[PDB]
Amino acid sequence: ENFQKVEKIGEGTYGVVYKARNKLTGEVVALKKIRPSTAIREISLLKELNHPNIVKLLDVIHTENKLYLVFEFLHQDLKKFMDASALTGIPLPLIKSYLFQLLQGLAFCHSHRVLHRDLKPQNLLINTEGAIKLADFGLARAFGVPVRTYTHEVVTLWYRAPEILLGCKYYSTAVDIWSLGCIFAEMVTRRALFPGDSEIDQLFRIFRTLGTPDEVVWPGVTSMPDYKPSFPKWARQDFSKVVPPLDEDGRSLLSQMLHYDPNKRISAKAALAHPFFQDVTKPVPHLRL
Numbered sequence: 001e002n003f004q005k006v007e008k009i010g011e012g013t014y015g016v017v018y019k020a021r022n023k024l025t026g027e028v029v030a031l032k033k034i035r036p037s038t039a040i041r042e043i044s045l046l047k048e049l050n051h052p053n054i055v056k057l058l059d060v061i062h063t064e065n066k067l068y069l070v071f072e073f074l075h076q077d078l079k080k081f082m083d084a085s086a087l088t089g090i091p092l093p094l095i096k097s098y099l100f101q102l103l104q105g106l107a108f109c110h111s112h113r114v115l116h117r118d119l120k121p122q123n124l125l126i127n128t129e130g131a132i133k134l135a136d137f138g139l140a141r142a143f144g145v146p147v148r149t150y151t152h153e154v155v156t157l158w159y160r161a162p163e164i165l166l167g168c169k170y171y172s173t174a175v176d177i178w179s180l181g182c183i184f185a186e187m188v189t190r191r192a193l194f195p196g197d198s199e200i201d202q203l204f205r206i207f208r209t210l211g212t213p214d215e216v217v218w219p220g221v222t223s224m225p226d227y228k229p230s231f232p233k234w235a236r237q238d239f240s241k242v243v244p245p246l247d248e249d250g251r252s253l254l255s256q257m258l259h260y261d262p263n264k265r266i267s268a269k270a271a272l273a274h275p276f277f278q279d280v281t282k283p284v285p286h287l288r289l
Contacts, residue, residue: 006021009030011153018030030070031068031071034068034069035150038142039143043139047059049108049112049114051108052104054108055136055137056071071135074127075287076127078121079122079124081287082121085190094283097130097280098124098187100280101133102180103268103271104268107272115171115176118155118159119176121186123135126287128285129284130285158192159179159182161179165226167224167227168224168225171262174265177257180257181258182258184253185242189243207231207234211235211236212234219261221260253271
């Protein structure tokens with residue numbers, strides 16, 4: 001069919017995002033224009049990957065040598081909500097609810113062997129009901145993660161796992177747990193944990209907080225493609241200094257999400273069972289739309 005431009009949703013990784021109305025159903029959607037037959041099959045399979053904490057992929061339209069994705073619309077992203085919450089911060093019970101829900105979404109995707117690989121606050125969408133949902137799952141495997149977007153914007157490295165930075169080709173579901181750990185820390189402290197501005201600055205910021213990794217904490221790290229023996233050797237800091245005022249349960253969970261060795265890093269399923277979630281609730285956020 002055809003939809004209106006409404007109000008240019010925003011510039012995505014792969015192309016423009018539109019708010020649009022479907023003229024037959026009346027539903028309001030997010031329409032993503034993507035700037036190739038393998039990609040078509042892989043993205044089409046995501047129409048079946050349905051979960052309450054995953055932004056629904058309604059349709060995949062291939063036409064005029066152009067690809068459009070139609071998604072469920074949500075009014076707010078976590079980046080905007082964090083910016084708007086800057087003076088007081090997001091309350092801990094809402095941080096906990098959001099982390100719990102995001103782990104549920106990851107556990108679902110990971111159980112179906114689907115990775116996100118580019119989690120960031122801009123692709124975590126929230127509604128008035130206290131839900132949060134992951135957007136753009138599965139697209140990285142289909143299209144890659146570019147250095148720059150279609151409008152030349154720099155794709156953020158802030159949430160990238162260290163095995164990706166060190167050149168591992170066959171990374172795993174653990175990369176999404178890393179990203180989510182970085183987002184958890186940012187919600188708590190109201191500052192990005194590792195705001196690198198180049199691949200080496202990203203790695204060195206990780207090393208300055210968590211210690212330079214070695215064969216003791218990460219067997220095999222020194223044989224990684226981009227590992228260099230000349231990396232400076234930084235000591236690892238206490239989480240008590242990194243994410244105040246997070247309690248011991250939260251610091252324990254964050255430490256397990258930020259293990260260097262992707263095999264040691266907690267799974268989404270195991271994280272759901274962590275004592276941090278013993279008192280989880282689902283509060284109502286204050287949203288001004």
